[PDB]
């Protein structure tokens, strides 16, 4: 409350962090379904459906360009990457098991880098 705060966590690595995790997930080889966004126009269903599209590219601008406040916000988008991908994707397809994949080796490299 009014001047009482919790003791400051380090925050000032974060943007980093957060780059290079990004990175690894660039670089994974199944994260091609989610390198850039869904094309819309030739994605028969995609626009009504998925209400927040996000990917990769888009991310890595929005972090190049100072629009994630924290770092809290960065997995947000990172996590409705590989749920918008549930909501189109059967289980048992490439894009759905490369989602549940990706989803996995983020949050172990989430948790091993500020949890």
Not at 11 to 37: G, N, Q, R, V, Y
Not at 93 to 102: L, P, T, Y
Request: aromatic share 10%.
């Amino acid at each position: 409350s009014m001047s009482v705060k919790k003791p400051k966590r380090d925050d000032s690595k974060d943007l980093a962090l957060c780059s290079m995790i990004l990175t690894e997930m660039e670089t994974h080889e199944d994260a091609w379904p989610f390198l850039l966004p869904v094309n819309l126009k030739l994605v028969p269903g995609y626009k009504k459906v998925i209400k927040k599209p996000m990917d990769f590219s888009t991310i890595r601008e929005k972090l190049s360009s100072g629009q994630y406040p924290n770092l809290e916000t960065f997995a947000l988008d990172v996590r409705l990457v590989f749920d918008n991908c549930e909501t189109f994707n059967e289980d048992d397809s490439d894009i759905g098991r490369a989602g549940h994949n990706m989803r996995k080796y983020f949050e172990k490299k989430w948790t091993d880098t500020f949890k």
